[PDB]
Design an enzyme around this catalytic site. Structure first.
Site, short mmCIF file in Angstrom:
data_model
loop_
_atom_site.label_atom_id
_atom_site.label_comp_id
_atom_site.label_asym_id
_atom_site.label_seq_id
_atom_site.Cartn_x
_atom_site.Cartn_y
_atom_site.Cartn_z
N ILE A 122 8.73 0.89 -3.10
CA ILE A 122 8.71 2.03 -2.19
C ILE A 122 10.21 2.31 -1.82
O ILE A 122 10.96 1.38 -1.46
CB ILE A 122 7.91 1.67 -0.94
CG1 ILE A 122 6.42 1.65 -1.29
CG2 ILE A 122 8.24 2.69 0.21
CD1 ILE A 122 5.52 1.22 -0.11
N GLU B 293 1.93 -4.16 -4.04
CA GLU B 293 1.48 -5.48 -4.53
C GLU B 293 0.05 -5.40 -5.03
O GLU B 293 -0.34 -6.09 -6.01
CB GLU B 293 1.61 -6.57 -3.45
CG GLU B 293 3.05 -6.70 -2.79
CD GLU B 293 4.13 -7.26 -3.76
OE1 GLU B 293 5.13 -7.70 -3.26
OE2 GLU B 293 3.97 -7.27 -5.01
N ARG C 186 0.13 -4.10 -8.51
CA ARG C 186 0.60 -5.15 -9.45
C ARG C 186 -0.42 -6.25 -9.79
O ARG C 186 -0.42 -6.78 -10.93
CB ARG C 186 1.84 -5.82 -8.87
CG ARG C 186 3.08 -4.86 -8.89
CD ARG C 186 4.13 -5.43 -7.89
NE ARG C 186 5.33 -4.60 -7.82
CZ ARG C 186 6.11 -4.50 -6.75
NH1 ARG C 186 5.81 -5.20 -5.68
NH2 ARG C 186 7.17 -3.70 -6.76
N1 ADE Z 1 10.07 -1.63 -1.03
C1 ADE Z 1 9.30 -2.40 -1.82
N2 ADE Z 1 8.43 -1.80 -2.68
C2 ADE Z 1 7.66 -2.58 -3.49
N3 ADE Z 1 7.58 -3.92 -3.59
C3 ADE Z 1 8.47 -4.52 -2.70
N4 ADE Z 1 8.69 -5.87 -2.48
C4 ADE Z 1 9.67 -6.01 -1.49
N5 ADE Z 1 10.10 -4.81 -1.06
C5 ADE Z 1 9.33 -3.86 -1.82
#
Ligand code: ADE
Length: 247
Positions: free
Chosen positions: A71, A160, A163
């Site tokens: 993000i 997450e 993913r």
């Molecule tokens: N901004 C972000 N977007 C996606 N995964 C992340 N993991 C840590 N910061 C993140």
């Protein structure tokens, strides 16, 4: 663009949202049936917006870089908010362009800084659909005293979850309750780049990793993953970070 509405949400509607999010990310190849994300994309193709609406019908739009599911910032109303990192000033040339005010948050969006800013580690921050509703609310009425924690709920409920099927499922089954993520979730989050790297190496080395990846299981047991027949590769990880988009 992809959308998720908390009003009337169910386990199912969350799963539909996360599948749509995965689909939105460009991929030309799959390895072991897992989409391999692009290593580089032109600006006009690099960002997707996730529009999130809470139970109270307030909406934020979240900009993600489709090559790494990171993000970069979000918009609420007329104001945009971006992380302080080069990749985020790059995103600001392409998304939320007609925002009236643009604020640059005081942190890169990485976990070690967000946990320091929130004064709480990820294991103690509630996830689940009600937590995502509350995070949308807190970011919509931005306040530096509360935003870091909400951003960590946002990141985990979008990036997450996209993913890993395991994270998607754990968050989605909590439609009316909340829960603290186990070390298993924390470990998958931590290990995404290393697992992605080894899975790509395996595709050139007969399914064997060149370096093992240690993960934490359902018994909080440290397990060593060394090949593509491991459950995390066959039935959990759902997106691969391109080896040339880390280094
Ligand atoms: N901004 C972000 N977007 C996606 N995964 C992340 N993991 C840590 N910061 C993140």
């Amino acid at each position: 663009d992809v959308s998720f509405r908390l009003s009337g949400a169910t386990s199912s509607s969350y799963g539909v949202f996360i599948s749509n999010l995965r689909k939105a990310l460009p991929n030309e190849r799959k390895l072991y049936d897992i989409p391999l994300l692009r290593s580089s994309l032109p600006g006009s193709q690099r960002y997707a917006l996730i529009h999130l609406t809470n139970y109270a019908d307030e909406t934020i739009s979240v900009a993600i870089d489709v090559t790494n599911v990171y993000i970069m910032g979000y918009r609420a109303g007329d104001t945009s908010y971006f992380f302080n990192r080069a990749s985020a000033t790059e995103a600001a040339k392409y998304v939320f362009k007609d925002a009236m005010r643009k604020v640059t948050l005081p942190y890169s969006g990485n976990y070690e800084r967000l946990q320091t800013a929130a004064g709480k580690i990820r294991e103690n921050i509630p996830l689940g659909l009600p937590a995502l509703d509350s995070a949308i609310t807190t970011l919509f009425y931005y306040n530096a005293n509360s935003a870091a924690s909400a951003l960590m709920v946002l990141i985990q409920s979008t990036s997450e979850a996209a993913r890993y099927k395991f994270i998607e499922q754990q968050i989605g089954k909590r439609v009316d309750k909340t829960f603290l993520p186990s070390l298993a979730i924390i470990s998958l989050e931590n290990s995404w780049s290393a697992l992605s790297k080894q899975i790509q190496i395996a595709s050139t080395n007969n399914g064997q990793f060149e370096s093992p990846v240690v993960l934490i299981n359902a018994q909080n047991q440290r397990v060593t993953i060394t090949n593509v027949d491991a459950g995390v590769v066959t039935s959990n990880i759902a997106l691969l970070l391109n080896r040339n988009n880390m280094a």
